[PDB]
Amino acid sequence: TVALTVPAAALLPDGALGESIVRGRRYLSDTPAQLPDFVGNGLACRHCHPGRDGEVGTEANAAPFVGVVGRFPQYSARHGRLITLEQRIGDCFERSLNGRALALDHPALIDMLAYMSWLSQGVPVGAVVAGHGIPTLTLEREPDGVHGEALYQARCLACHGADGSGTLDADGRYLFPPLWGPRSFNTGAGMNRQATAAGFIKHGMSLSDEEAWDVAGFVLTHPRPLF
């Protein structure tokens, strides 16, 4: 692998590329408000691809976008063929954001690509960045949703709510995003898979593997939009 580094925002170039990168950041950070025609729930990309200092997709083990551009196109079992990064973004719009994919030449999509390419500056094509993806967590026992409920009350509820509906900020964006119900990710999302939810919870959200497994199980007992 190669190291995860985050470029300096002060070193952004003047001109069309720099302006596109800034728009891209905003689409990724503020997706429901910026792209209402394409987002069907309350989630922005940053809610599963977090970043510090206003950036998005810069955190190891929380599916950073640093180095993502050099890993596409790639085979998708989901599609049964090679897909592009534009198509992969469309999938997260359809599933994680319960919405609609942008056209593959939509200016907002191109701005999101520009931003991801900026984060990827200096990463060799084909290289794997340390911390890429959301590593799965699997245990060789059933997730105990009863234990998970108790863990949820103790460790998660204060932010994500008794009803998993999250907490809005003053501007109507989710400070703490919804984990289930009509404003959360749909059943087609990767986060709807036990081992992915457990891995995300483990690395972001301290919890033991056993606790992450059980609380993921509890989270995933709830209704959410059907894909």
Task: Report the Cα–Cα distance between both ends of the chain, in Å, rounded.
Answer: 35
Gyration radius of the chain's alpha carbons:
17
Query: Minimum Å distance from CB 14 to ligand HEC?
Result: 26
CB nearer to ligand HEC: give 19 or 149: 149
Q: 66, 97, 119, 198: which one contacts ligand HEC (CB under 6 A)?
A: 97
Task: Tell me if 137 contacts ligand HEC by CB under 6 A.
Answer: no
Task: Quote the tokens at residue 11.
Answer: 């070193």
* DSSP reduced 3-state for 175: strand
- Name the DSSP letter for residue 221: T
Determine if 31 is a binding residue for ligand HEC (CB under 6 A).
Answer: yes
Structure tokens at 108: 């907002």
- Choices 7-15, 18-26, 41-49, 119-127; region in contact with ligand HEC by CB under 6 A: 41-49
Q: What's 12's DSSP letter?
A: P
Residue ranges of the annotated binding site for heme c are: 45, 48-49, 156, 159-160
Is 143 one of the binding residues for ligand HEC (CB under 6 A)?
no
Three-class SS state of 20: helix
Q: Which residue has the tokens 């059907």?
A: 226
Nearer to ligand HEC, 12 or 83 (CB): 83
Q: Whose CA is closest to 223, among 166, 183, 169?
A: 183
Q: What's the rounded Cα separation, in Å, for the pair 42 and 174?
A: 7
Residue closer to ligand HEC, measured from CB, 11 or 90: 90
Yes or no: say if 215 and 199 are a contact pair by the CB < 8 Å rule: no
Any contact of residue 205 with ligand HEC (CB under 6 A)?
A: yes
The position carrying tokens 């640093």 is 66
Stretch in the footprint of ligand HEC (CB under 6 A) among 1-9, 15-23, 117-125, 203-211: 203-211
After which residues does the chain have a break in its backbone, defined as C to next N over 2.5 Å? 205
Give the number of residues in contact with ligand HEC, rule: CB under 6 A. 45
Asked if residue 220 binds ligand HEC (CB under 6 A), the reply is no
- Return residues touching ligand HEC (CB under 6 A): 28, 31, 43, 45, 47-50, 63, 68, 71, 85, 88-89, 92-93, 96-97, 112, 132-134, 155-156, 158-160, 176-179, 184-185, 189-191, 196-197, 200-201, 204-205, 207, 215, 219
